Design a protein around this ligand. Structure first.
Ligand SMILES: C[C@@H](CCO)[C@@H]1NC(=O)/C(=C/[C@@](C)(O)CO)NC1=O
Ligand SMILES: O=C(O)CCC(=O)C(=O)O
Ligand SMILES: [Cl-]
Ligand SMILES: [Cl-]
Ligand SMILES: [Fe+2]
Length: 280
């Protein structure tokens, strides 16, 4: 089974689906395809995902395997071997300019502003007053959220699922994938996400679900996984969360229609609990 996802594009007015019914389905499912801008170069990011795990013998990106949690004072960051086939390199935007290769930081900045534009179209369709967007999004309705540019490599030799079923933590994930393996559970059936290297996959995360859970049309965080890989696979994604710095956490809120925002938990708190459940 392959999912029939709606396709969108970023245009002069924001997210453009084929019509209003198509936007409504896409937002209800919590997953759709987004056309990649023709000027946007993804080849350095593609190369980074193929290389980051390989060590200093492999140029220019293999040396990032050596950067663990500890070099960043944030357990979330650096190279992480997961219990699934997946291994990752995760870096939050405050470190991009200093730590990533300059062309990788550039990529992360393009994706941040693209995701920013995507998120603002979603918030407008949710009927949340604009003056509440910054607090409801922990800064992602502007450019003051926390942003992780995360690179993924699936070790086909590991006898695990590729990546366990899960929801992402945040508001928006912009996923770059060029090979089969991603599956989504929109209703109660698992379905393959069709591969289209001209489109990103756009997902909503748990924060979008929490934020809109009391709205007239709640938006859901899509349950997704990566099936066991028999050959290697790589990908990367840009993740937007309520600002979750150590000691400067914007928090997670739900919107109560006609009332305002009610605090639910911390952003880092939600990330830690989610990561814990994904991998145990
Ligand atoms: C906030 C960071 C996660 C920090 O750990 C961000 N949000 C996610 O939900 C996530 C999911 C996984 C499955 O890739 C983690 O393995 N990736 C990310 O980059
Ligand atoms: O590699 C993929 O296609 C999905 C990765 C993912 O879902 C994640 O890291 O959150
Ligand atoms: Cl830090
Ligand atoms: Cl390894
Ligand atoms: Fe995910």
């Amino acid at each position: 089974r392959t999912a029939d996802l709606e396709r969108a594009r970023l245009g002069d007015d924001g997210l453009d689906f084929q019509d209003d019914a198509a936007q409504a389905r896409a937002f209800a499912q919590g997953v759709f395809l987004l056309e990649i801008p023709e000027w946007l170069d993804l080849s350095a990011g593609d190369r980074f995902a193929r290389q980051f795990f390989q060590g200093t013998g492999v140029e220019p990106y293999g040396k990032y395997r050596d950067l663990s949690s500890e070099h960043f004072g944030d357990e979330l960051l650096g190279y992480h071997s997961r219990v699934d086939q997946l291994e990752q390199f995760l870096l939050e935007r405050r470190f991009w300019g200093e730590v990533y290769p300059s062309e990788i930081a550039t990529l992360g900045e393009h994706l941040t502003l693209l995701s920013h534009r995507v998120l603002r179209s979603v918030l407008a369709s949710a009927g949340i007053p604009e003056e509440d967007w910054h607090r409801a999004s922990g800064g992602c309705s502007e450019t003051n959220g926390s942003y992780h540019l995360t690179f993924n490599h699936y070790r086909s030799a590991h006898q695990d699922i590729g990546l366990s079923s899960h929801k992402d933590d945040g508001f928006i994930t912009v996923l770059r994938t060029t090979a089969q393996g991603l599956e989504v559970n929109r209703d109660d059936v698992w379905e393959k996400v069709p591969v289209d290297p001209a489109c990103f996959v756009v997902n909503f995360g748990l924060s979008m679900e929490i934020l809109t859970s009391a709205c007239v049309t709640p938006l859901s965080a899509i349950m997704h996984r990566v099936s066991h890989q028999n050959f290697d696979r790589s990908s990367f994604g840009h993740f937007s969360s309520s600002r979750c710095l150590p000691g400067a956490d914007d928090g997670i809120y739900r919107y109560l229609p006609s009332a305002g925002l009610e605090r639910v938990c911390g952003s880092r708190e939600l990330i830690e609990e989610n990561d814990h459940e994904i991998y145990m």
